[PDB]
């Protein structure tokens, strides 16, 4: 079997500083470097990073300035990744994307490598195909975290002259052709369509109610699901007797709000129709759905990386997070950052809720009913997973 | 000791470079006789494509799937493309220790010259000579 | 370990850039691999006479002909880098 | 001993008799084929700090 020998543990203690400049330099170095490396390698784990640093004693993480820096570094990290940069930092003082050679060909031209030149060759080939009108086959759109999305092949940059890239349409690119494209804005105005993601389809994803693969069978209150089915049958609409039925998330939100506290369930069961059952919950549900969704999107993403993967899959409809392309991944991460910014800014209660890390403090800052609903939902998820584990064991 | 003839006689069926001639991995035209940069594999067959032997470029005689050289200088034709035996049999991609993106092969059928069609070709061609008619 | 940096043993570049015996100024803060101890004389003589064979297939410090004189090399002035030359 | 008595199987026409004139360094530069042989820290930083 596998057995670890021993693991060390370090106590969480906030760093003390005698003067202000020391604290400024420390927070800059530590937090900025960690955030940039995260946004470069795996920008999804920014929430885990923020949670860990707040646990270690970083108070100013959930501020508007830090969140703006985070989204800016995420956008620039996507830009660098599309350029073909491997390491975000050339030195501890300056970034790698801000290195200009002097006394050479140009004094402000970014210092390019052969890998960056080949990536610009790919970009220019895609742009020339787009201009000719035929289907532009950008090679790195099928590139993901685990590797290529569909092709089990292996590719590596820079490509040599013995095994170069072949184009069935005959479009050719050359370093002599890319030579004028040397500055950041000049290459952005040309290859913007391939470096920038698309965040439009996600504008209403994080603000919409969702459940972690929860269905009517996994509802903890059999009486609640049966009374919901009886109301839907009293209404002139057909019902599905099978456990795997498609129920709307807005309706399942009210179902969980009912099943959380039994008083409201008994008060709503005597009503005539599910229409009235949702109407009587509408006033209290509006002031709690936003809060419970915010709490869920922060908790399920600040604890473990696998939970972040599952959350992103469930909310974006992705089949596999290792198979989905990196552009839409970056788009979803940026939209999640914008959602966190909205929660922190537009709502005054969001910043203390984000700073709170324990159940006691989250109950103190959150409505008791909303916390009960959220705990019931997450406990239903945990019960489903535990039943799956029991079926595995048996 | 070698047990194969030298200077194979093509009086029965001459093997000449055609005027029009494309590749197997590339389907692009090649040089006819000015440069031997192509690889000629003759077998004396009019079977499609490229009768009396297909042609390959030196750089492109490699496998088309894994883009690697050949093991024993033997390729596998797969729906118009040339694959390697590990690729055709379905085995995993094996990176060779020697040259990667080019194989050991001579130019202008020099490596495939010691085997093929020789003189006489058929049995009815010898009796044509030994008979007075 | 060694006092001199590790790029003098194996340069940071894949080609082996920055290989050889580097002399430093007495008042300088950088440190080189030119040492005259009875333990360092073997490797110094090896670099001077035999040279150094890199795994890429090239002799970096002394291919052949006239051997270099590390006592008269100009003083070391820095370190290599992948971005710029030096 | 094969062939010659002092030289053995080492034929005069094949190779050099003594390929060590003075000293020879058995070490080969970058024999480990590491991606970055400049040291533990050199040039760009590797991985996030702490």
């Amino acid at each position: 079997t596998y057995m670890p020998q021993k693991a060390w543990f370090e106590p969480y203690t906030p760093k003390k500083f005698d003067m202000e400049h020391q604290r400024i330099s420390h927070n800059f170095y530590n937090l900025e470097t960690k955030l940039i490396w995260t946004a470069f390698d795996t920008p999804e784990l920014i929430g885990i990073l923020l949670h860990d640093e707040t646990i270690k004693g970083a108070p100013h993480l959930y501020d508007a300035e830090f969140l703006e820096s985070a989204v800016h570094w995420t956008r620039e990290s996507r830009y660098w990744r599309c350029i073909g940069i491997t390491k975000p930092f050339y030195n501890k003082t300056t970034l790698r994307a801000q290195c200009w050679h002097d006394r050479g060909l140009q004094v402000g031209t970014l210092v390019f490598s052969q890998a960056m030149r080949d990536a610009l060759m790919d970009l220019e080939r895609a742009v020339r195909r787009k201009e000719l009108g035929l289907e532009p086959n950008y090679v790195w759109d099928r590139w993901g975290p685990v590797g290529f999305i569909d092709g089990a092949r292996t590719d590596h940059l820079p490509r040599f002259a013995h095994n170069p890239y072949v184009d069935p349409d005959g479009v050719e690119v050359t370093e002599v052709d890319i030579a004028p494209f040397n500055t950041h804005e000049q290459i952005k105005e040309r290859y913007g369509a391939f470096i920038d993601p698309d965040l439009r389809p996600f504008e209403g994803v994080f603000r919409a109610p969702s459940h972690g693969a929860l269905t009517l069978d996994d509802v903890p209150h059999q009486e609640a699901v049966r009374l919901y089915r009886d109301l839907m049958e009293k209404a002139d609409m057909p019902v599905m007797l099978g456990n795997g039925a498609e129920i709307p998330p807005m309706d399942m939100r009210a179902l969980f709000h009912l099943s959380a506290n039994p008083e409201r369930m008994k008060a709503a069961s005597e009503l005539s129709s599910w229409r009235e059952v949702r109407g009587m919950l509408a006033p209290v549900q509006e002031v709690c759905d936003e809060k419970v969704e915010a709490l869920r999107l922060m908790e399920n993403t600040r604890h473990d990386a696998a939970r972040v993967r599952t959350f992103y899959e469930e909310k974006c409809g992705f089949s596999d997070f290792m198979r989905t392309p990196d552009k839409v991944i970056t788009a979803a991460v940026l939209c999640y950052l914008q959602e966190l910014q909205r929660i922190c800014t537009e709502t005054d209660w969001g910043k203390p809720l984000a700073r709170c890390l324990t159940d006691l403090e989250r109950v103190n800052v959150m409505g008791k009913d909303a916390f009960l609903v959220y705990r019931h939902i997450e406990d239903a998820i945990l019960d489903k997973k535990r039943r799956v584990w029991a079926t595995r064991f048996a | 000791r070698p047990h194969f003839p030298a200077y194979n006689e093509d009086v029965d069926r001459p093997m000449v470079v055609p005027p029009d001639a494309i590749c197997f991995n590339c389907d692009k035209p090649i040089d006819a006789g000015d440069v031997n940069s192509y690889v000629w594999i003759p077998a004396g067959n009019a079977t499609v494509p490229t009768p009396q032997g297909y042609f390959f470029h030196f750089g492109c005689f490699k496998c088309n799937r894994c883009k690697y050289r050949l093991g024993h200088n033997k390729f596998y034709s797969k729906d118009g493309k040339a694959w390697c035996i590990p690729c055709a049999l379905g085995r995993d991609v094996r990176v060779p220790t020697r040259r990667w993106h080019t194989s050991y092969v001579n130019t202008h059928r020099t490596g495939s010259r010691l085997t093929g069609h020789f003189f006489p070709r058929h049995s009815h061609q010898m009796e044509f000579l030994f008979d007075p008619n | 370990k060694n006092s001199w940096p590790e790029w003098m043993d194996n340069g940071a570049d894949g080609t082996g850039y920055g290989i050889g015996l580097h002399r430093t100024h007495p008042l300088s803060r950088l440190r080189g691999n030119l040492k005259r101890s009875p333990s360092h004389v073997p490797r110094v003589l090896g670099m001077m006479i035999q040279g150094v064979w890199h795994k890429s297939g090239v002799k970096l410090y002394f291919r052949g002909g006239k051997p270099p004189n590390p006592s008269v090399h100009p003083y070391l002035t820095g370190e290599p880098c992948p971005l710029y030359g030096w | 001993k094969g062939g010659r008595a002092k030289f053995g199987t080492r034929a005069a026409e094949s190779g050099v008799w003594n390929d060590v004139g003075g000293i020879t360094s058995r070490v080969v530069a970058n024999m480990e084929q590491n991606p970055h042989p400049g040291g533990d820290d050199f040039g760009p930083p590797r991985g996030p700090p702490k």
């Binding site: 390698d41 993901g144 | - | 080609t15 297939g57 | -």
Partner: peptide, 22 residues
């Protein structure tokens, strides 16, 4: 580590030798 970026092989003496061979 886990890094989402373009496939980039480090410049290895073996890679330099293969390029010189080609």
């Amino acid at each position: 580590r886990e890094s989402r970026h373009l496939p980039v092989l480090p410049m290895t003496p073996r890679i330099v030798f293969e390029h010189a061979n080609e």
